[PDB]
Design a protein around this ligand. Structure first.
Ligand SMILES: Nc1nc2c(ncn2[C@@H]2O[C@H](COP(=O)(O)OP(=O)(O)OP(=O)(O)O)[C@@H](O)[C@H]2O)c(=O)[nH]1
Ligand SMILES: [Mg+2]
Lengths: 610, 47, 36
RNA sequence: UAUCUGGUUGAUCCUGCCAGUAGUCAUAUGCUUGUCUCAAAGAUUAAGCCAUGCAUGUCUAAGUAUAAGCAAAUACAGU
RNA sequence: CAUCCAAGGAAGGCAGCAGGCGCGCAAAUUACCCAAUCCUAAUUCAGGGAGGUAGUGACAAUAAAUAACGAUACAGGGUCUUGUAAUUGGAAUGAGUACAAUGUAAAUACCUUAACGAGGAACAAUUGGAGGGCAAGUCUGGUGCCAGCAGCC
């Protein structure tokens, strides 16, 4: 065609360095492709969960945010509260119960934006670290730090140094360069206007990431609660029969199909099947939805809905294009067909205000109900309704002080479920068999088998100890991190066991041995095995004597000494326990302390024996 | 108070670093005893 | 007076917990030990 | 004053390449980051697109004062 | 390209200072002031995101803390010279905290200083590597395999 000499440039080195740096910038954009599965017409409100220590002032933060984005001060905040921002955005705020870890774990599983608040004068606390680890293990949402109580500092030098230290600790825990907000005072029950304005501005322009777990399993945030039973049914049969309960909220993630009887998991409650579902009209619509509606026929102050409270070129590019083109073919075949069968075959895509109703609901979900704890509903894949044993890998968490122990209770969260199991920790005998480990290694990973509901492979899980708020102390609560390797029913776990025995009559190259067995058939069953002495000479067993009850005769290569003690080495197969206990943390009269099985050291200290 | 305070292990965040001597903080003392062992060796061989 | 479904579920969970704790606090089985 | 050593050979020599050690107004990244002084910061890929706020106004004794403006020389007289 | 609405019409240009988007993988404050340097006007007086001040990822660069002197017992060179020690004795001091004063447009900070502040100096230094090259291991244990010897060491 032409010459490469003619199409040259004036500067080689600048091309070399700019091209290398541009290649690095271009490979910074590459990612692993997944699917969004988010609606384009009416996206659901983003969930903003505020998380921090008890007395640090999160209610004032959500109060100031709502006041700045609505010009309306609201008091007595409880439950999720929905606000509209801009022309398309809606944010549902939710306050975290600080003391409980259960709803805390559910919040970290559910939330899309997490406002994490830290006392500036005190410093970082254990609740912040625990929530950060739970969020990191279960799929990290967008974390935004805010620091309060900064008017308690009496010097500017200490204030600047503490701000730098908190910012760098946050940059260690979260990505580096993450910006966090500094809140000055509470002078009128709320924060200064400029900082609240910057908080509102940052979250009104931010975009979110498609997490792996949110894009296949449908989930639901419940905004209000109502019990639907006839009062005569309450009166006549003793007020205790399990009830029909209808609950309201917003669907996120995946269309939950419109056929009745789909299986449902409620975190902190259990597992049900939904009786009926329907799509109520949205009670807090975006304004743009209102001009769209008015355009179908061609909300000045109700921006708050709080019923809970009182008033090609690159492979990455072509795979993303493939995901987008199958998404738009699915959308365009959805658009050309009647809306009733759209509702029938897709089943309530996200952004829909959905009222669902179950049957057979216990009392303590209704009787001891409180508005200050979140309610989370979750759709279930079929693989998660089956039970079995799971073989995973886990480590002792690097901030947990003490190691774990085999056959001890562990309260672990996996998927949408949170339950207490009795795992057995095994190592491998160098890819030959499954060696049973009595303890947990201090700095390496061990496999673990435990009974529970099945799940997809490569699904993260996180275990903790007892969740009662009384005997917490200064210790850290996360105890096991890892992913699941495989699901099965039975695996071979092997424990080495050496039976002990003594000699009583010594011939030459032949001994008479007693004190391991008590019957002749026990010796006759184990004939042909090899017994080894303590000193180290080799031999085997030969015959069982008839008239003695347990004495038998065995062979040896050398003359056995009288004080030598024989042992027989066997490989006893042990089995897992089939205990499955859901935590039912939302089904308690206090919900701050739930005790199931206690640790071995705990019960040994309780009844005073070693 | 009931506020669960921070721990030293989880604040400074130095995990699995090898335990080094007190004299590795200051280079002057380490080079002092290095030169001192060197002159002891020199005094032992130049007798 | 009368028992609910939650009450019977919690009492059977509680007796399972009591049985498991009694099994755990007791001495281990000879097949679950070493150099026995 | 000017940092090279091997392989490519059983040795002797070109030629390119590879492995290693060291220096970097070189790009990117990681770990760590107590004090003093100092001073660089959206060019590298897009002179791509911009919410909101500010960035150019100005009166002397000395151009025009009936402000139903403010306080105290019947032509005005201060501000 | 793109904003507003009553649908008739009106309005737009951050390669100024902040700040945001441009990937779902990221990086300074939408801060204070004309006190300094100068610029503008009718003009000593007003204005100036020009500019200065402070804040912010170790750009780059300078100087520099994290210890110093002993007594006792062993190991020494062997009567005068050193090391080791869950041994011991008093001195000296700033990283921080802080009345004050200085500093500054007002501050922060620096320089100065009444007082507090050190034995595990816990007031808790890091990053790598070890036959070579151009330095520092003829150190230790464990793991996968062997139709090699013995046979479960
Ligand atoms: N000094 C100071 N006080 C604050 C600040 N923020 C909040 N407070 C005070 O801290 C108090 C406690 O916070 P709460 O209003 O009770 O909010 P909360 O974190 O949900 O605490 P609980 O309601 O008990 O769970 C408030 O009454 C505020 O007066 C702050 O930034 N500085
Ligand atoms: Mg509150």
């Amino acid at each position: 065609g032409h010459n490469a000499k003619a199409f040259a440039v004036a500067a080689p080195g600048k091309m070399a360095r700019t091209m290398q740096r541009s290649s690095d910038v271009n490979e910074r954009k590459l990612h692993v492709p997944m699917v969004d599965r988010t609606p384009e017409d009416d996206p659901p409100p983003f969930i903003v969960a505020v998380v921090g220590p008890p007395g640090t002032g999160k209610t004032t933060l959500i109060r100031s945010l709502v006041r700045r984005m609505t010009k309306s001060t609201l008091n007595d905040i409880q439950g999720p509260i929905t606000v509209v921002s801009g022309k398309h955005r809606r944010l549902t705020f939710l306050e975290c119960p600080a003391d409980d870890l259960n709803a805390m774990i559910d919040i970290a599983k559910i939330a899309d934006l997490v406002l994490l608040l830290i006392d500036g004068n005190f410093g970082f606390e254990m609740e912040t670290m625990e929530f950060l680890n739970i969020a990191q293990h279960h799929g990290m949402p967008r974390v935004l730090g805010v620091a309060t109580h900064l008017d308690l500092f009496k010097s500017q030098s200490t204030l600047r140094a503490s701000k730098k230290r908190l910012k760098h600790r946050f940059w260690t825990e979260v990505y580096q360069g993450a910006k966090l907000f500094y809140l000055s005072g509470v002078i009128n029950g709320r924060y200064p206007d400029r900082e609240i304005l910057n908080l509102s501005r940052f979250i009104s322009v931010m975009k979110f990431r498609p997490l792996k777990w949110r894009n296949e399993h449908p989930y639901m945030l419940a905004d209000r609660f109502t019990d639907l039973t006839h009062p005569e049914l309450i009166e006549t049969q003793g007020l205790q029969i399990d009830r029909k309960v209808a609950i309201y909220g917003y669907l996120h993630g995946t269309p939950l199909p419109s056929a009745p009887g789909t299986r449902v998991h409620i975190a902190g409650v259990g597992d049900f099947s939904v009786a009926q579902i329907e799509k109520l009209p949205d009670p807090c619509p975006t304004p743009f939805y209102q001009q769209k509606l008015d355009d179908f026929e061609r909300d000045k102050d109700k921006l708050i809905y709080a019923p809970m409270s009182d008033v090609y070129d690159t492979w990455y590019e072509l795979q993303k294009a493939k995901i987008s083109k199958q998404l738009e073919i699915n959308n365009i075949e959805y658009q050309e067909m009647t809306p009733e069968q759209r509702q029938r075959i897709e089943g309530f895509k996200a952004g829909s205000y959905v009222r669902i109703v179950f049957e057979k609901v216990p009392m303590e979900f209704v009787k001891n109900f409180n508005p200050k704890f979140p309610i989370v509903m979750g759709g279930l894949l079929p693989t998660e309704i089956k039970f079995g044993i799971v073989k995973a890998r886990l480590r002792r968490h690097r901030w947990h002080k003490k190691i774990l122990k085999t056959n001890d209770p562990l309260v672990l969260s996996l998927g949408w479920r949170r339950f207490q199991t009795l795992p057995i920790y095994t190592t491998t005998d160098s890819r030959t068999r499954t060696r049973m480990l009595k303890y947990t290694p201090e700095h390496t990973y061990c496999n673990a088998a435990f009974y529970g509901p099945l799940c997809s492979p490569n699904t993260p899980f996180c275990g903790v100890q007892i969740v009662a708020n009384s005997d917490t102390g200064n210790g850290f609560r996360i105890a096991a991190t890892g992913i699941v390797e495989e699901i099965d029913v039975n695996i071979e776990i092997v424990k080495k066991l050496k039976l002990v025995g003594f000699p009583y009559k010594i011939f030459k190259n032949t001994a008479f041995i007693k004190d391991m067995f008590s019957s002749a058939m026990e010796v006759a069953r184990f004939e042909g095995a090899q017994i080894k002495t303590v000193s180290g000479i080799r031999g085997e067993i030969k015959r069982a004597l008839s008239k003695p009850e347990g004495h038998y005769r065995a062979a040896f290569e050398d003359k056995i000494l009288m004080s030598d003690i024989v042992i027989l080495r066997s490989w006893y197969p042990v089995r897992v326990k089939k205990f499955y206990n859901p935590v039912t943390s939302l089904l308690l009269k206090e919900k701050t302390e739930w005790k199931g099985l206690r640790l071995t050291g705990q019960i040994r200290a309780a009844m005073n024996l070693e | 108070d009931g506020k669960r305070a921070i721990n030293y292990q989880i604040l400074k965040n130095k995990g699995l670093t090898p335990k080094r001597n007190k004299d590795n903080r200051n280079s002057r003392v380490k080079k002092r005893k290095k030169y001192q062992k060197a002159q002891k060796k020199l005094k032992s061989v130049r007798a | 007076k009368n028992l609910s479904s939650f009450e019977k579920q919690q009492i059977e969970i509680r007796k399972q917990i009591e049985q498991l704790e009694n099994e755990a606090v007791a001495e281990k089985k000879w097949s679950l030990k070493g150099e026995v």
